[PDB]
Amino acid sequence: PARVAIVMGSKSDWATMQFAAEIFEILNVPHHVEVVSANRTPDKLFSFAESAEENGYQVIIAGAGGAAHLPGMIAAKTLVPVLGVPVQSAALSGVDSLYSIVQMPRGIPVGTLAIGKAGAANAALLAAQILATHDKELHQRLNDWRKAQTDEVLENPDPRGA
Amino acid sequence: PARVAIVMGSKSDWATMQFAAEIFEILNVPHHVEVVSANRTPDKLFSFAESAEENGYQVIIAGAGGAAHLPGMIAAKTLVPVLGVPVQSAALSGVDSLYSIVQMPRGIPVGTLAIGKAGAANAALLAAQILATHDKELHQRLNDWRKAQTDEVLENPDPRGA
Amino acid sequence: PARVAIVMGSKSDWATMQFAAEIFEILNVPHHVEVVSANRTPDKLFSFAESAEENGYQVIIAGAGGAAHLPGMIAAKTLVPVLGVPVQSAALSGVDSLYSIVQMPRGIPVGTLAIGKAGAANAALLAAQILATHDKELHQRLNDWRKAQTDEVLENPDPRGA
Amino acid sequence: PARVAIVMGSKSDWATMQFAAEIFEILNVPHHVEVVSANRTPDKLFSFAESAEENGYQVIIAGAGGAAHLPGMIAAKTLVPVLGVPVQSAALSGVDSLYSIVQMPRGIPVGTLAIGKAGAANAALLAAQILATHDKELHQRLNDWRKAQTDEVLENPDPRGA
Amino acid sequence: PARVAIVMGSKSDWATMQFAAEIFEILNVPHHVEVVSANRTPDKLFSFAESAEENGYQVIIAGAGGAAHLPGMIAAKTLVPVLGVPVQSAALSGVDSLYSIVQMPRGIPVGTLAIGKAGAANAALLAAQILATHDKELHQRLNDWRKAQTDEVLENPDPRGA
Amino acid sequence: PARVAIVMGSKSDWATMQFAAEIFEILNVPHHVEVVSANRTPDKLFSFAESAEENGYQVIIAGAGGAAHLPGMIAAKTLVPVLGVPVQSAALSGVDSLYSIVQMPRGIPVGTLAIGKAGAANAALLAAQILATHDKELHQRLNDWRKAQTDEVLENPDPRGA
Amino acid sequence: PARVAIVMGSKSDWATMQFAAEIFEILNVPHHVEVVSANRTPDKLFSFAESAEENGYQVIIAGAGGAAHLPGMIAAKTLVPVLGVPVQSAALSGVDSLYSIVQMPRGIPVGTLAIGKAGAANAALLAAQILATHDKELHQRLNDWRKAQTDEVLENPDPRGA
Amino acid sequence: PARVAIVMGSKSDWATMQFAAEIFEILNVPHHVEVVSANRTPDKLFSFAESAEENGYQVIIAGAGGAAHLPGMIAAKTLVPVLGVPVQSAALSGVDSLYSIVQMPRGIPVGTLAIGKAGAANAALLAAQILATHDKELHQRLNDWRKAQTDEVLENPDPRGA
Numbered sequence A, B, C, D, E, F, G, H: 001p002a003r004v005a006i007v008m009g010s011k012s013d014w015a016t017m018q019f020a021a022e023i024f025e026i027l028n029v030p031h032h033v034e035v036v037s038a039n040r041t042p043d044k045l046f047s048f049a050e051s052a053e054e055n056g057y058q059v060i061i062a063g064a065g066g067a068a069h070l071p072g073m074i075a076a077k078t079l080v081p082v083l084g085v086p087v088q089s090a091a092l093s094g095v096d097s098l099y100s101i102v103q104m105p106r107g108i109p110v111g112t113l114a115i116g117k118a119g120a121a122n123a124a125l126l127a128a129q130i131l132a133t134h135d136k137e138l139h140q141r142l143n144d145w146r147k148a149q150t151d152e153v154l155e156n157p158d159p160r161g162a
């Protein structure tokens, strides 16, 4: 079953969020992907959040740009851990996204990742690490992936041209 | 009837939002005041927004600090104009409040006012000006108020001590 | 008659403000468009603001970039509600526009929208929502528009390639 | 056993991190608390991170101010999910803390919370929600806590003085 | 005659602008001081700017906080050089004041000074240096003042306690 | 004689400062242009500043990007009014230029203009307005120029395509 | 002999720079302390920089607030390594100090430390580490100091009250 | 022997750090270049830092973008002076890099240079100046280089086209 869901405020966010999905593909982690907007589909957001647990989601990755309300609104309607990804906005280069996601008041948390593509990928990795706590196989695949990343740098110490 | 409602994410916002109410008192404008949180009372926010029109509200002033979702979520659930007040937050002095309120994407607007007390008062004044468009009496009181503000400065040109 | 006017500090602002006008076209809302600069045509700004009410304007959308004085100066000379649009400036990407428009002192409000194109469109939508309070037809068209925006997202939940 | 550990760069961070511990006390969640500095006790950080899994930690909350390296360094040495809390710094009011924690590159994530006390508490709540995924009892206590927070606001709608 | 005028948006600005006046007192430079608000006394601002030249002003120092429109509006209505002083605002510590004053578009300049008291004093010094270009006496007094400032530092090289 | 000098930290600044010179060409104002760096030609800066008055300069326009020391260092070595132009830097888009120029301490002023090309032009206009105080002809040309700028906007009120 | 000099733009900087001197006292490192201002004592700055090498200085720590020109100007006049300390300014909390010091163009470096007291101390530590490269004794004292700092944290792992 | 080492968090940093190496080539200064990541090769970072002194390094230049931990972690594990270069990050244009490097707490310093290429070059120049303190030859080459930079500007005073 899909233990993790990736949601975003707009299809225009996909160019960023696609990197979260990429991680799940590499790690062979079943995942759900959907466009859910707190501003354009508020009712759907509520139904989505309310049914998150019953649908089997253990982690929810939500991405949005500008005045991002999606991550926080979902977190306010469910106990499923919510990780937020600040999409890089045009004018404020994601600073508004970042602040509107991370500065949650006491009581309703949202684990925030870096602005942009790096954050999208990291949100998937973090969600995967959360799942790995109770999934020996995934935990193993995660370990292998990290090893591969490290070794790639280790076997290529000199950045200068050959 | 109360044609305007003043809502805020927390009772701790009252120290700021009280200045919006003060304007309505001076202008003799019936108003509703209530604590509505998108993060702590999400369901109530929805019911409040959905019934806004039927309850007779023509303008809604919403204030919040930090990652402010209140103004935007209300605006996403009603056609009643929503004015947002960025409450000055401790760490980011309202910058996060400001960005999380004003940077709304295309489709759902929130007329934003200055950070803090000045903004709270101005949101009431703006809402009043909106109501005055169809309320000759209020329009008159608004005019008198502005005159009084101007004349006070005009009759006190020298700021130095007498 | 035109119940709303769209003004901007420079013709170079049109690339942004055009999106406000686009909304009015979609909603069939009569509107006036004009270049009015507080810095280059200060006298005209005053005459424009002073005659706003008599000319039938119920809302004024003003856009400017950099040290934006246009919105505030108009608001200081009329009771007609003024909505400001921060045009994205080159160096400071609209942050200066934003601050110079929203940070109005107590007494003279300016409902501010997002930086750039999204804000321009939203200012028109907000102005339209204000007009809809007393225009059943427009209120209906607004409702249909919102429905269309929501349904478009609802019928396209998966952002991935078919 | 303690399934969660709370670490911080300095004892001066305790004034902030104490709010994370407070949450665990309310929720009856066994937790470990310790001062671990990437800058002053780098070797200890490594030993702490390396033994995190074997010691039974499923989540690690790390707080630091200024150029915060603690959260990221721990996350680079273990698969245990790491949540970071930006402590409010004097000069930059936590902005440096925030950026130095959240802007992690692809490969090593750190779920970041709000700057300051609110973030500390939220990091505990998020960690608790993560644990609740497999702890029915804790999940229940979390649910009761949220209910209590919501109801407190619901039974106190008017912020004005009685 | 008074060749320089010091204006400010509010009497609350006097705590800052008083330092500009202090410089003129030290240099024995006749000056006019007055509260002129672009937002509260727009008409007066226009009359003041329009009559600036005929009244004998060769330099105008204008101070304001927040969305400062005063300096720019005066500069748009007269050829008399305008120097602007960003008053330190509460929420944004003068950053909004600074941006709203200095970021003037091509065509209408405003020589901006530092945020706060230091800027107020410097605006007077700069205005004095401008006047000194054609006032040998003032030029001399300016020179003596600078010498005194320099010598004070020179005769006190060690900041440690005696 | 040349009553105004335009200096800059690097030849790479010319792309910006050229707009200051353009103003002087339009106004037929004799001017000197030279590359003077506080960091690369510190001694020359001193000689240039020290001889400014004797060389007949009444105003000095200095432009620089990044940690701009040029404007301030010149102002510290002469009584000739110094106007500073913040060149738009790559990384910080002129914010560092702006702060390093405008935030001068009490005692040594630098009238700062907008970041970039607009500021360069404005610095020339401001310097020209300063000179016009005692140059009836230039004052007249300035007046004509402003009229032309205003009239261009006035005769082109509609920004839409014909 | 004194191999390191501590200079600052104003005696008001001493409250910050005193922490640099404190480090040298602890490490028994002979040092010179003096107020040198690029803005108020420009000539002295030049003489100081020019004679730095002949006077035996191997490192120069310079602190200043606001538009800090001191560090950069010294570095432009000598080959002696210059370390800069951004003093926390009132309005911009050291951000202007930071930018005006660190953003030096290619050719003239200034090793910058943290804003405020922490930076002052660190500049002394860094300078000491530089000297230690050729001073076995100092290198030893530095090592002991670091050990003491580390051990203090190590023997006090629990920040909670006994 | 190589008395200076240039390290960076990723090979993608080479486009920036290459300018540090360029300086060493011009000055004929033996140097080591290597990719060392605190996040991807934490163990290697430790071994690298621990063996820095024994390997003969007297200065270490470390560059990284985003949440830069590399410079600080190295400095926490060795007495060899560490100079940090903030690589310009996409979203925050190096501001996050800058803050995460310079805002080190008391006890472990990192001399920080400008964001980007200019900083990379300057870090090499600063490191060279440090080495020159005990290398007469290098000190001479440094002097010649500075002379050449100065003279190039001096013989090209007019930036206008011939």
Ligand SMILES: Nc1c(C(=O)O)ncn1[C@@H]1O[C@H](COP(=O)(O)O)[C@@H](O)[C@H]1O
Binding pocket: A008, A009, A010, A011, A012, A013, A036, A037, A038, A039, A040, A063, A064, A065, A066, A067, A068, A069, A070, A071, A087, B105, B106
């Ligand atoms: N922040 C939100 C929300 C929300 O918070 O519900 N919905 C959309 N958005 C953001 O609007 C930006 C522009 O979206 P469009 O391209 O569809 O106009 C995107 O970054 C989206 O995440």
Ligand SMILES: Nc1c(C(=O)O)ncn1[C@@H]1O[C@H](COP(=O)(O)O)[C@@H](O)[C@H]1O
Binding pocket: A105, A106, B008, B009, B010, B011, B012, B013, B036, B037, B038, B039, B040, B063, B064, B065, B066, B067, B068, B069, B070, B071, B087
């Ligand atoms: N931004 C929001 C929301 C919301 O967006 O729904 N709810 C509360 N808050 C803000 O949290 C801050 C601290 O509130 P508390 O003092 O109750 O912890 C307030 O500024 C409130 O507006």
Ligand SMILES: Nc1c(C(=O)O)ncn1[C@@H]1O[C@H](COP(=O)(O)O)[C@@H](O)[C@H]1O
Binding pocket: C008, C009, C010, C011, C012, C013, C036, C037, C038, C039, C040, C063, C064, C065, C066, C067, C068, C069, C070, C071, C087, E105, E106
């Ligand atoms: N902010 C203002 C005002 C005003 O405030 O009156 N007038 C023009 N502007 C802005 O100058 C920028 C550049 O305009 P130009 O392209 O005509 O130089 C535009 O964003 C305009 O809105």
Ligand SMILES: Nc1c(C(=O)O)ncn1[C@@H]1O[C@H](COP(=O)(O)O)[C@@H](O)[C@H]1O
Binding pocket: D008, D009, D010, D011, D012, D013, D036, D037, D038, D039, D040, D063, D064, D065, D066, D067, D068, D069, D070, D071, D087, H105, H106
């Ligand atoms: N950021 C770090 C690290 C680290 O990253 O390892 N170690 C200490 N610190 C921070 O230094 C600040 C001042 O600490 P001190 O009061 O002990 O000088 C604290 O916020 C701490 O978290």
Ligand SMILES: Nc1c(C(=O)O)ncn1[C@@H]1O[C@H](COP(=O)(O)O)[C@@H](O)[C@H]1O
Binding pocket: C105, C106, E008, E009, E010, E011, E012, E013, E036, E037, E038, E039, E040, E063, E064, E065, E066, E067, E068, E069, E070, E071, E087
């Ligand atoms: N910026 C302006 C203008 C203007 O631009 O005309 N008028 C007042 N203000 C500023 O409002 C702030 C608060 O003023 P109040 O204390 O009177 O509310 C002051 O800094 C004033 O300069």
Ligand SMILES: Nc1c(C(=O)O)ncn1[C@@H]1O[C@H](COP(=O)(O)O)[C@@H](O)[C@H]1O
Binding pocket: F008, F009, F010, F011, F012, F013, F036, F037, F038, F039, F040, F063, F064, F065, F066, F067, F068, F069, F070, F071, F087, G105, G106
């Ligand atoms: N800020 C200064 C100073 C100075 O302050 O003396 N000298 C050069 N610069 C700036 O360095 C930037 C890059 O210059 P280069 O292209 O020559 O490397 C320019 O903006 C220049 O004004």
Ligand SMILES: Nc1c(C(=O)O)ncn1[C@@H]1O[C@H](COP(=O)(O)O)[C@@H](O)[C@H]1O
Binding pocket: F105, F106, G008, G009, G010, G011, G012, G013, G036, G037, G038, G039, G040, G063, G064, G065, G066, G067, G068, G069, G070, G071, G087
């Ligand atoms: N930045 C400089 C320079 C300089 O750059 O030469 N000289 C003084 N200053 C700074 O002015 C601030 C206020 O100084 P005062 O208290 O003497 O007015 C201090 O932070 C000083 O370092």
Ligand SMILES: Nc1c(C(=O)O)ncn1[C@@H]1O[C@H](COP(=O)(O)O)[C@@H](O)[C@H]1O
Binding pocket: D105, D106, H008, H009, H010, H011, H012, H013, H036, H037, H038, H039, H040, H063, H064, H065, H066, H067, H068, H069, H070, H071, H087
């Ligand atoms: N900041 C760090 C660290 C570290 O601090 O150890 N490791 C990599 N990075 C930075 O990640 C950015 C993107 O790197 P990638 O292109 O490899 O994803 C680079 O600027 C690197 O310095």
